Write a protein that binds this ligand. Structure first.
Ligand code: 1Q9
Ligand code: MN
Ligand code: MN
Ligand code: NA
Ligand code: NA
Length: 300
């Protein structure tokens, strides 16, 4: 006989779809219909799943929109190279397809590059940006985390890199768990694996690290990233920066610097964390975003 009697693993959000440049994109859409929407953008190799435990904190007061990038999550998977340029084109068109006007961004990893680049080009529409573990220029390999130098150098080759990421699914099975301090459960791993069970679908997982602005290459990405970082230092847009210890892309020392150099910026320590801060302390991140959103309406 039986009797009846943690960081959430479920994804209790109804699928929403919109046609974007002839392809179907999936997104979470919850919360009130009026007011300024909060747009959550994930990076590599995740999906809207990464926001699952953060969104419920914001949804009571704001619309939350969390798309899966083209070729990822539940969005369609056209035969693209999935360059950053492709993601930009699709994300621009997604935002237009939903008829969004002003927005608040919550962005992470490659999602931050998309968010920052979009904000730079749409200064009058951005009402706030929350960000963490974001893409910035990496002048030399010495400025890349030591533990991942050899690995990412290998990733950034055609034959070896594709064998690792596409054939062996290393970014999902290897790199992903290394971006979280706590161990991911099998249920969580399965939600992350889901979009990429078919090896040929793993193209964006390989192109993304090959797009990273490292040692001047790719030059186009480096220029673009420098441009939005320059814009960011000059914009009065409200900013909220989450960081963890030791972090990965944004070490604590770097978070302290940005908190001062970026105008109108608040920085929040999430405790232990690497790249996927959302997976180590989603309640703090969600709570702080919800409260920060409230202060955006306070004049002073
Ligand atoms: C230094 C390794 O850092 C990472 C770790 C340890 C884990 C994950 C998931 C991601 C990254 C990095 N971000 C990333 N790489 N290519 N596209 N986005
Ligand atoms: Mn179509
Ligand atoms: Mn192809
Ligand atoms: Na399993
Ligand atoms: Na999934």
């Amino acid at each position: 006989h039986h009797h009846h009697h943690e960081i959430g693993t479920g994804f209790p959000f109804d699928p929403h779809y919109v046609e974007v440049l002839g392809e179907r994109m999936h997104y979470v859409d919850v919360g009130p219909r009026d007011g300024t929407p909060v747009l959550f953008l994930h990076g590599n190799p995740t999906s809207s799943y990464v926001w699952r435990n953060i969104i419920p904190h914001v949804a009571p007061t704001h619309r939350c929109i969390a798309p899966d990038l083209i070729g990822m999550g539940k969005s369609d998977k056209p035969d693209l190279g999935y360059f950053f340029d492709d993601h930009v084109r699709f994300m621009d068109a997604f935002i237009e397809a939903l008829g969004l006007e002003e927005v608040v961004l919550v962005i992470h990893d490659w999602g931050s590059a998309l968010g920052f680049h979009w904000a730079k080009r749409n200064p009058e529409r951005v009402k706030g940006i929350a960000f963490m573990e974001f893409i910035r220029p990496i002048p030399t390999w010495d400025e890349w985390p030591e533990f991942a130098r050899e690995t990412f150098q290998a990733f950034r080759t055609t034959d070896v890199g594709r064998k690792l990421i596409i054939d062996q699914n290393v970014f999902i099975e290897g790199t992903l768990p290394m971006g979280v301090v706590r161990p991911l459960t099998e249920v969580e791993m399965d939600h992350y694996r889901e979009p990429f069970l078919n090896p040929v679908d793993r193209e964006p997982l390989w192109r993304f690290p090959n797009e990273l602005p490292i040692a001047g290459e790719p030059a186009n990405i480096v220029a673009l990233v420098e441009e939005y970082m320059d814009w960011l230092h000059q914009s009065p847009v409200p900013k909220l920066l989450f960081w963890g210890t030791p972090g990965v892309l944004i070490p604590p020392a770097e978070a302290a610097r940005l908190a001062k150099s970026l105008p109108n910026c608040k920085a929040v320590d999430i405790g232990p964390g690497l790249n996927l801060l959302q997976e180590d302390n989603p309640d703090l991140i969600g709570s702080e975003i919800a409260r920060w959103l409230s202060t955006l309406e306070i004049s002073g």
